[PDB]
């Protein structure tokens, strides 16, 4: 199996929680972790990305 090469579709026994903003808490999206404040962004991405 690969790591960080495709969007999440398998994962494992990990239940998803809620979404909190304006806080410097940890996050996890498709295996990629980190630490930062989730705010608003005016820039948009692409549908195939």
């Amino acid at each position: 199996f690969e790591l960080l090469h495709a969007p999440a579709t398998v994962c494992g026994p990990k239940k998803s929680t809620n979404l909190v903003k304006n806080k410097c808490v940890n996050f996890n999206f498709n295996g990629l972790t980190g630490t930062g404040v989730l705010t608003e962004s005016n820039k948009k991405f692409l549908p195939f990305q």
């Binding site: 820039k43 948009k44 991405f45 692409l46």
Partner: protein
């Protein structure tokens, strides 16, 4: 019908992430200068290639 070849391109992204310009390297002596500087404006003078 054309075949793809491994080359070097310098993608130029705008304010929306749309590729609008791509300069190919390893083809012309002028294009090889912009490949190292990673820019589109080359001033006058002597530069090093390889």
């Amino acid at each position: 019908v054309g075949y793809l070849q491994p080359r070097t391109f310098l993608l130029k992204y705008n304010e929306n992430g749309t590729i609008t310009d791509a300069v190919d390297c390893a083809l012309d002596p002028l294009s090889e200068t912009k490949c190292t500087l990673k820019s589109f404006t080359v001033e006058k003078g002597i530069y090093q290639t390889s």
